[PDB]
Write an enzyme that holds these catalytic residues in place. Structure first.
Site, PDB file in Angstrom:
ATOM      1  N   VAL A  45       7.435  -4.530  15.274  1.00 27.08           N
ATOM      2  CA  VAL A  45       8.360  -4.794  13.839  1.00 27.08           C
ATOM      3  C   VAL A  45       7.583  -5.427  12.698  1.00 27.08           C
ATOM      4  CG1 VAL A  45      10.156  -4.712  15.642  1.00 27.08           C
ATOM      5  CG2 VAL A  45       8.637  -6.558  15.310  1.00 27.08           C
TER       6      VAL A  45
ATOM      7  N   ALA B   9       4.164 -10.428   8.217  1.00 22.33           N
ATOM      8  CA  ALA B   9       3.607 -10.608   6.887  1.00 22.33           C
ATOM      9  C   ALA B   9       2.859 -12.346   6.931  1.00 22.33           C
ATOM     10  CB  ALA B   9       4.802 -10.705   6.029  1.00 22.33           C
TER      11      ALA B   9
ATOM     12  N   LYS C  19       1.733  -7.459   0.274  1.00 20.77           N
ATOM     13  CA  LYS C  19       2.414  -8.454  -0.318  1.00 20.77           C
ATOM     14  C   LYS C  19       2.015  -9.545  -1.264  1.00 20.77           C
ATOM     15  CE  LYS C  19       5.147 -12.494   2.444  1.00 20.77           C
ATOM     16  NZ  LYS C  19       4.555 -14.082   3.062  1.00 20.77           N
TER      17      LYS C  19
ATOM     18  N   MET D 149      -3.059 -15.006  35.278  1.00 19.67           N
ATOM     19  CA  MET D 149      -3.436 -16.125  36.175  1.00 19.67           C
ATOM     20  C   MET D 149      -2.642 -16.081  37.277  1.00 19.67           C
ATOM     21  SD  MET D 149      -3.812 -20.187  34.646  1.00 19.67           S
ATOM     22  CE  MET D 149      -1.615 -20.363  34.073  1.00 19.67           C
TER      23      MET D 149
ATOM     24  N   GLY E 231       4.242 -17.473  10.688  1.00 19.47           N
ATOM     25  CA  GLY E 231       3.551 -17.593  11.694  1.00 19.47           C
ATOM     26  C   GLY E 231       2.037 -17.112  12.098  1.00 19.47           C
ATOM     27  N   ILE E 232       1.305 -16.389  11.463  1.00 19.04           N
ATOM     28  CA  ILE E 232      -0.031 -16.372  11.509  1.00 19.04           C
ATOM     29  C   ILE E 232      -1.196 -17.596  11.044  1.00 19.04           C
ATOM     30  CG2 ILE E 232      -2.217 -14.375  10.116  1.00 19.04           C
ATOM     31  CD1 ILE E 232      -0.214 -13.145  12.227  1.00 19.04           C
TER      32      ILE E 232
ATOM     33  N   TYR F  31      -7.131 -24.217  -5.219  1.00 18.24           N
ATOM     34  CA  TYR F  31      -5.948 -23.986  -4.344  1.00 18.24           C
ATOM     35  C   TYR F  31      -6.565 -22.846  -3.026  1.00 18.24           C
ATOM     36  CZ  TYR F  31      -1.280 -24.060  -2.882  1.00 18.24           C
ATOM     37  OH  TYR F  31      -0.476 -24.388  -1.804  1.00 18.24           O
TER      38      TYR F  31
ATOM     39  N   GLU G  49      -4.771 -26.656  -0.505  1.00 13.80           N
ATOM     40  CA  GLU G  49      -3.738 -25.971   0.166  1.00 13.80           C
ATOM     41  C   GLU G  49      -2.707 -26.429   1.265  1.00 13.80           C
ATOM     42  OE1 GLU G  49      -3.821 -21.612   1.353  1.00 13.80           O
ATOM     43  OE2 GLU G  49      -1.718 -21.525   1.125  1.00 13.80           O
TER      44      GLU G  49
HETATM   45  N1  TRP Z   1       0.451 -22.381  -0.670  1.00 11.79           N
HETATM   46  C1  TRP Z   1       0.763 -20.537   0.058  1.00 11.79           C
HETATM   47  C2  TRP Z   1       2.721 -20.990  -0.511  1.00 11.79           C
HETATM   48  C3  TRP Z   1       3.373 -19.995  -0.619  1.00 11.79           C
HETATM   49  C4  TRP Z   1       3.586 -19.109  -2.505  1.00 11.79           C
HETATM   50  N2  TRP Z   1       5.071 -18.658  -2.023  1.00 11.79           N
HETATM   51  C5  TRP Z   1       4.767 -17.559  -0.704  1.00 11.79           C
HETATM   52  C6  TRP Z   1       5.914 -16.841  -0.078  1.00 11.79           C
HETATM   53  C7  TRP Z   1       5.380 -17.201   1.624  1.00 11.79           C
HETATM   54  C8  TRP Z   1       5.512 -17.808   2.450  1.00 11.79           C
HETATM   55  C9  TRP Z   1       4.516 -18.642   1.727  1.00 11.79           C
HETATM   56  C10 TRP Z   1       4.044 -18.478   0.238  1.00 11.79           C
HETATM   57  C11 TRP Z   1       0.214 -20.374  -0.927  1.00 11.79           C
HETATM   58  O1  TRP Z   1       0.351 -20.071  -2.326  1.00 11.79           O
HETATM   59  O2  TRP Z   1      -0.068 -18.559  -0.708  1.00 11.79           O
END
Ligand code: TRP
Length: 526
Positions: free
Chosen positions: A46, A49, A78, A196, A359-360, A452, A459
């Protein structure tokens, strides 16, 4: 001789194989890595992102270019999260409603806002709105990406030329499978199939081995719990309590599926959508030929059949003849992510609804921080304590941020949207909202994008920057009571800053007119 010699990982999904791959790359031949499959339930793909640091922190570490891994997991691009209908009342529908002659949507893109006189572009936008000389939404004024996304452009030219900061959509099962092959074929991780039987512990409660159903003892010094919501080691064996945070974030269920899509009609949206519903919100994660979608809702406010039908109605699906994933969520985190010689990673450690694709990222961060605090066999407490603090601070920060989306939303038209305003607001977020209303930046970035996105720790210490707070607050209709007071003392800086708005407008035209479609890039890649 106190160093770790053997590591055993429980669970063979995304978390398990990301952990196996990374640690095996980091430790090489100095440690044997064994992963016990502990077969998980088979779900429809499903979609998932991510955030930009995934390539630099993880794939680059493994030496894998996007050109190589993206085709293996049907990955797509994305550029932002697009929030749909968070300001207007009504049914759960895929299309944005109209508000003040504009569609009710706003974007939350990546990257850092430029600055003039060391004041973020956001504050100049707020100044102009206050002065009444513009009525442009924050995201369209300050991000060139907005124009790109409305024209469904790729984030790059076809020959690789970068245009905008981006991350990825993919099917997490395909990624796990790609990483499984990578780790076993190239990094000499041993894959053990099966369940397990039991976890063997010593007189001090440390794990000494995982025993498989065929009676094999997988001995080790360090054990990673990647068993998901089950928490087979960290919760069940080590008896570490889970802190339920469903009081603060009401959503605890999802109904999801994957839908085949004709991309020639309208292309592939280079963004994740978060569509406001009557009792929650739905994601949409577009890839080539298909998108993943799920309705995240609160069981306190909607019945299962209600959610299912609302979900199907929005996508025009026949509820009787549609494969659906029906999932119950565990919202919150362990009291401690790392206990004795057991480190939980992924759903085993913590979980929030995927409103901002965490998540990831949580896995990646957990993995990265584990190597930063990597133990020897003495297992000094300062290491796990430090790790636990970083994991806790990371989770709670984002949890509070997610809550703010529902709290600051002006919607009150259903019991769910209204109940969100009645929830206790954490003191730190109350302060942030008061800072914002007074015109102050929130978590302003102090480095350029190269630093960054170049150094993970930069970050990690400033993950939700000023730009993100403005994306969400201004997106949801909240603007400062007044502009930053110092700006009233610097009219020349204000006049100068306007050129930056002209620059965004120029970039917006350039991007739309010359970038290939997201579809065209994906077809060249795949
Ligand atoms: N530290 C993330 C913060 C972020 C900006 N836009 C986002 C949208 C979704 C999730 C996280 C973000 C980044 O710059 O990549």
């Amino acid at each position: 001789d106190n160093r770790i010699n053997r590591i055993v990982i429980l669970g063979g999904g995304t978390a398990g194989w990301m952990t196996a791959s990374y640690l095996a790359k980091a430790l090489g031949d100095t440690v044997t890595i064994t992963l016990l499959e502990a077969p998980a339930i088979g779900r429809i793909g499903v979609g998932e992102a991510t955030v930009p640091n995934l390539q630099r922190v993880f794939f680059d570490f493994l030496g894998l270019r996007e050109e190589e891994w993206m085709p293996e997991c049907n990955a797509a691009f994305k550029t932002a999260v697009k929030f749909i209908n968070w300001r207007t009342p009504g049914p759960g529908e895929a299309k944005a409603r109209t508000i003040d002659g504009r569609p009710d949507h706003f974007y939350h893109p990546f990257g850092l806002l430029p600055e003039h006189g060391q004041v973020p572009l956001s504050h100049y936008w707020a100044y102009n709105r206050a002065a009444g000389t513009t009525d442009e939404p924050f995201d369209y004024a300050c991000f060139a990406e907005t124009a790109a996304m409305d024209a469904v452009r790729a984030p790059k030219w076809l020959d690789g030329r970068p245009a905008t900061r981006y991350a990825w959509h993919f099917d997490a099962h395909l990624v796990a499978e790609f990483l499984r092959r990578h780790a076993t074929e190239r990094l000499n991780v041993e894959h053990v199939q099966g369940e397990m039987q039991q976890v063997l512990r010593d007189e001090r409660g440390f794990i000494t081995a995982l025993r498989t159903v065929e009676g094999r003892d997988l001995e080790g010094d360090l054990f990673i719990d990647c068993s998901g919501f089950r928490g087979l080691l960290i919760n069940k064996a080590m008896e570490e309590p889970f802190i339920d945070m469903n009081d603060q974030l009401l959503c605890n269920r999802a109904v999801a599926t994957a839908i085949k899509h004709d991309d020639d009609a309208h292309g592939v949206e280079p963004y994740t959508s978060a569509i406001a519903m009557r009792s929650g919100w739905s994601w949409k994660i577009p890839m080539l030929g298909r998108f993943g979608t799920g309705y995240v809702y609160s069981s306190r406010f909607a019945e299962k059949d209600e959610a299912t039908l609302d979900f199907c109605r929005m996508w025009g699906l026949d509820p009787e003849n549609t494969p659906l994933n029906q999932v119950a969520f565990r919202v919150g985190r362990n009291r401690r992510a790392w206990v004795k010689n057991c480190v939980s990673i992924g759903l085993a450690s913590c979980f929030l609804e995927p409103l901002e694709s965490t998540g990831i990222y949580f896995i990646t961060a957990a993995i990265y921080q584990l190597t930063q605090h990597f133990p020897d066999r003495t297992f000094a407490l300062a290491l796990s304590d430090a790790f636990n603090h970083e994991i806790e601070a990371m989770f709670d920060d984002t949890r509070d941020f997610i809550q703010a989306h529902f709290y600051v939303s002006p919607r009150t038209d259903t019991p769910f949207w209204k109940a969100n305003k009645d929830l206790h607001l954490p003191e730190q977020m109350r302060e942030k909202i008061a800072m914002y209303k007074a015109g102050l930046p929130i978590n302003a970035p102090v480095t350029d994008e190269s630093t960054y996105y170049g150094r993970f720790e930069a970050e990690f210490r400033n993950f939700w920057t000023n730009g993100s707070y403005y994306c969400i607050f201004a997106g949801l209709g909240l603007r400062p009571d007044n502009p930053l007071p110092m700006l009233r003392h610097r009219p020349e800086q204000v006049r100068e800053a306007q050129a930056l708005f002209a620059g965004v407008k120029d970039k917006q035209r350039e991007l739309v007119e010359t970038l290939p479609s997201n579809l065209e890039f994906l077809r060249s890649l795949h």
